[PDB]
Amino acid sequence: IKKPNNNKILVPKVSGLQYRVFRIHLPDPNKFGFPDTSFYNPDTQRLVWACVGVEVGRGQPLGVGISGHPLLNKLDDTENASAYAANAGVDNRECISMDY
Amino acid sequence: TGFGAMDFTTLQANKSEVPLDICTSICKYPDYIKMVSEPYGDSLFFYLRREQMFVRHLFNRAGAVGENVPDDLYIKGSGSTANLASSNYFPTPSGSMVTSDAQIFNKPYWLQRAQGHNNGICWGNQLFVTVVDTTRSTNMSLCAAISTSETTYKNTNFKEYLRHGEEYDLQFIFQLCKITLTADVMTYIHSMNSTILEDWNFGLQPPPGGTLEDTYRFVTSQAIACQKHTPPAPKEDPLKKYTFWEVNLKEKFSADLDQFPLGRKFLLQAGLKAKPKFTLG
Amino acid sequence: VPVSKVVSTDEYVARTNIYYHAGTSRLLAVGHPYFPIKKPNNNKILVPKVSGLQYRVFRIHLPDPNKFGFPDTSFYNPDTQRLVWACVGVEVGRGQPLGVGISGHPLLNKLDDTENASAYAANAGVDNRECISMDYKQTQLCLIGCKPPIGEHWGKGSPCTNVAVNPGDCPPLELINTVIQDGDMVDTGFGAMDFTTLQANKSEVPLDICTSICKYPDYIKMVSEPYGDSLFFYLRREQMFVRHLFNRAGAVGENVPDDLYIKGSGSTANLASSNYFPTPSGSMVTSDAQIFNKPYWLQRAQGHNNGICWGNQLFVTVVDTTRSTNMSLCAAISTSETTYKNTNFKEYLRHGEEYDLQFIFQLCKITLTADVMTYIHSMNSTILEDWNFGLQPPPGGTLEDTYRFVTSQAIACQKHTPPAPKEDPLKKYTFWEVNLKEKFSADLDQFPLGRKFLLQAGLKAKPKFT
Amino acid sequence: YLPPVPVSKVVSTDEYVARTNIYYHAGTSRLLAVGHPYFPIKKPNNNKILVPKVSGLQYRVFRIHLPDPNKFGFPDTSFYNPDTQRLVWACVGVEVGRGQPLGVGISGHPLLNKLDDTENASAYAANAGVDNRECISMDYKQTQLCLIGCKPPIGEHWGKGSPCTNVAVNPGDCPPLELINTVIQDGDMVDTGFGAMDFTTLQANKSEVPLDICTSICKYPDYIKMVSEPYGDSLFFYLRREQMFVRHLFNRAGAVGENVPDDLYIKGSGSTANLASSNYFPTPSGSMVTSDAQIFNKPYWLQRAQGHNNGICWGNQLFVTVVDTTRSTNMSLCAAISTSETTYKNTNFKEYLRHGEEYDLQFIFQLCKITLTADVMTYIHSMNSTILEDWNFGLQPPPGGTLEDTYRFVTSQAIACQKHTPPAPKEDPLKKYTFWEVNLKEKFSADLDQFPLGRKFLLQAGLKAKPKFTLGKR
Amino acid sequence: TYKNTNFKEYLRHGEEYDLQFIFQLCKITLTADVMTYIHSMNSTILEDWN
């Protein structure tokens, strides 16, 4: 959503069908306070983290959401057609939604 | 979404073939064949996926036929069927029942051995968690009344809206690892990624010249020169042209593992219970 | 000074080998599935609202194990020790047959069926509302803990002091946490939102949730609370698919950006409504996917509270959308006629629920030393107040002067006698309070869950016949 | 409870703060500040500050922020036990670098309340007319100081008091004086030879002292109060070097509020019938600035602080108050309205004023351990509660939890708020004061010999880094 | 404004493959009986080995 005369986003776009790429930032282990620190010489060694386990929590209830176009380019339903239709005029578009 | 992994903005000037969800977007599919065949295995070292779909409805497309049906594929009709209906079919996708059993999330994942050569090492103090979840995409439809006085329903009185809310919570268990940088390991790391060593140390008599930057006070005013972002600094993230959901865990590390659900799950998995201090139980 | 780092109950709570069985007789509840019936003049409830999609939050009351008269109490010292109940087993029995009930609205805000349109929809008028019904999302859950559960839903918040709110603007959302109560509606496929505030239409969702607040259990917050009291066990199953795809009717509150589509001409000049909503459907219910009617042995709880029922309490939250069959009754206004007339019969709806709970409690002794006392007092103070030990008697005595003739007019007014009892902190909430104080029994062999527990533990009964 | 009894006296930090042999170097890069010496150049329509006030007569209170050592990682792993001990920084060395050349900068008032020059007067002039003010400038008294503490400094000045509700006050009466104690903030004017007084309140004339101090408070550090405080937090050590001589003896025009008694003189005649104004005021002058008399550009090693706090930087904080009027040259820069002219014209050139300060602070800190037993805990709590609280030592998790809800786009519409208006948790009470906040959280380095103060400290201690190269010495 | 005759519709389909094998070297001691058996099985085998 954005107000037409401006170009500032009032409501962003948050759908269930987007990639959620999180970019975690970990503390620099070479500047850390452990139970003991002189376990590694800063002049010939360096520290780094390793991912040992992970859990992605999810909060909202399960559910399927549907989307569609108010003007979707469909001519006719070809699944089961009783007879031959008419000929395509101008702007045969339709309002059609679908679960992904 | 069931319409292909294509660029709908440039490949479909119609702007009406696919829903508003991906009418002008790019639908991207993860390149597992390329992310796995990478030499160092940095881009991915653990992945899960579920994806199901069936064809709900079968439709047609309107528009000028781009490529005609070859005349040796059908026998020419006459009458209503003298002009061919459009053979540009497209299926309406449908992801079927969602279930609590087939869920990938809300479960702990112990990275015992990675897929490639990078066995879970978060180089550069960085981690990327990509998540798609089309099983919680309920769009909450909510309306507002412009006139609270009316006691007869009128469509022109209520303004309809659509909303969607996501909720995430990421928990990790990290392990401190130490790397002894000898000549061999240093040259191997410099071959793998030079930014790694350029970010720690090991070769920099830093400049031969001074690196003292003199910062101004009240740097918004118009009494000084031009102190605003004009020359760059070691601000150069190579991933700055990309927009990720940033998560800063620099202040959220904690060695008291049994105080958090994933921490005590990790303990219970490794045995490794905390030492009981309170006398006798 | 005292301590940090919440510790497991397995460190200060010492278990015994004394097990007790407690169980409710049979819990029935009849009512109306959609709304509660009430008299026109009064507001006394004649027939309550008993739906298959409500939360059943049972508040169990256990007898104080410190006032149990044991034959040889030499196994604990009431001078330095106190007792508590640990929940070792549980079974949530369900009675009615498997079935799916449907709800609907006589005036639901639905424009048309946008699944497959034969032609572009004609003009929109006034009051395009239809009568649409739907079976909801399927759900089962069972949460057990010593504190009431915590729910989540989206609600209306107050906007900032930055934007001018015009009449008809979209209400801002906010994730609100609440205590799930007995009679709160579970989420049904339309989300966990506050339908009373977020939809002034009053016609967007069916009748039983059009004014209610559909809540979802907040597992992210319940498992992450420090002491782990709200839940130390939970199961859940839920399935849903989109049955029908519909459209909304009303003034479009947010227009489609003009760079998403190509402007129409004639029939397709006015944009059809782009507010869509699917009707949920929980598909086939099966006896193979049943959570209930099974014994649950709580060996290792999820949190640090390993099943200790502090304060002699226990909350069992249950949702079962698998036995939501609404029975359709009917009464004849006159029993004489020999021909059917729609005006001759009064149609009704009724829903009946049936529960039966059983638990196996283990007695545990807490030896209250100084640091144990300080830890328990920091964790919960009403514990060390319920158990006579703390609050040593600060003041001394004081004369009250006890005027002899209190109702005479030669002295002042002696009135005081002020206080009414002020105990219940959970008085504001409504639960299905189950009283198991006169229901404890040490003869586990004589009860179904008791003998299931014996069989699972080994421990056959002592033989009586040669 | 509590087998020991509370210690009734203040003890020196050398009794519970254990010092380690781990030293760190911290340093700002270079702190510049350009502005106007006399007043802030505000907009004509708005009151946004375009060029701030940056003079040589101002207090410069830096609020140094150190990194939390309870979240670090020294060449050790578990040298400290986080359940019983907590770490804290102790300042053991400082050096306040100064950048610009030495020099003196004058100031003045276009309309200064000066009647006549009573130094060497020729004869008796007539009484004052109307608006007898002149354009007079003066160089102030010369000052340098360096206060270092772990709490902000504490100034002193004479303000206006509330007269007792027994006297009948008429308009124009003399305002009663009262010595006010206030925390010195960055930008407060240092006294200049006219006293440590409130000039906005005590002089409604607005026309007696020069432009930089005519509407501002001139504070003096309250050493009497700062060294006599119980715990000694706001003063580890200090330096001061002030000097002034009276240059010109002047007068002051206006209604004589208190007349000379008819006992102290003999009534005159003729031109001496009415007494000339006897409200004399001198013009200060801080004399020659020299390089041998500098307080700055030298290292200052803290062997023993003045009070009981022996250099411990409680709350991971440190304050460096710096004044010096020995580098206060205002640069006089002008501009041309038109470059096409080939002659001179006073209306062709617009003149301006500027002043640029340059600092560079370097420190040397030393990690310290505080084994928080019972009595040490009670002491640290009674001394300062926020010390023992801002490191969460004796606290369990509350039964509720701390699961924040963060929205990824917090500016957007239709999420209820920015959600964080109220400053409830961990708000230091210095919300109210303005300091030159210096952030040394990313500037600590254990490589001492790589920095100038680092190798100065190594020399003073007698050490040197172990060689990276073999024989070849000298 | 949208017009059916203004837009040409096409269909496309793209396949993506990636084949990986692990081969093992094998030796054949070509005696008389083995040679006769391989010659009965397939003689071009015994031909392409010269």
Author numbering:
A (entry chain F): 52 to 151
B (entry chain F): 203 to 483
C (entry chain B): 16 to 481
D (entry chain A): 12 to 485
E (entry chain E): 354 to 403
Publication passage describing the model:
Quasiviruses were used throughout the work described here. In this study we used a subparticle refinement approach that allowed us to overcome the previous resolution barriers in HPV structural studies. The high resolution capsomer maps were recombined into an icosahedral capsid with 3.1 Å resolution overall (ISECC_recombine), a dramatic improvement over the original 4.5 Å map. The recombined map allowed the full asymmetric unit of HPV to be unambiguously built for the first time. For the six chains of the asymmetric unit (chains A–F) there was strong continuous density stretching from Tyr12 to Arg485 (A), Val16 to Phe480 (B), Met1 to Phe480 (C & D), Leu3 to Gly483 (E), and Met1 to Gly483 (F) respectively. The improved resolution of our map when compared to the previous 4.3 Å structure (Guan et al.) allowed us to correct the 36 residues making up the C-terminal arm extensions (402–439). The pentavalent and hexavalent L1 capsomers share a common core architecture but have different connecting arm structures (residues 402–439). The connecting arm extends from the base of the donor capsomer, looping into the neighboring capsomer to make a disulfide bond between Cys428 of the connecting arm and Cys175 of the neighboring capsomer, and then returns to the donor above the initial extension. The most compact conformation was in L1 chains A and F, whereas in chains D and E the conformation was the most extended, with chains B and C exhibiting an intermediate structure. The second, larger putative L2 density, approximately six amino acids, was found flanking an L1 loop region that extended from Ser306 to Ile327.
Human papillomaviruses are non-enveloped, circular dsDNA containing viruses with capsids comprised of 360 copies of the major capsid protein, L1, and an uncertain number of the minor structural protein, L217,18. Five copies of L1 intertwine to form each of the 72 capsomers that make up the T = 7d icosahedron. L1 takes the form of the ubiquitous jellyroll of anti-parallel beta strands (BIDG and CHEF), which are connected by flexible loops that extend outward from the surface of the capsomer and constitute the majority of the L1 hypervariable regions. The asymmetric unit is comprised of six L1s, five of which make up a single hexavalent capsomer and one L1 that contributes to a pentavalent capsomer.
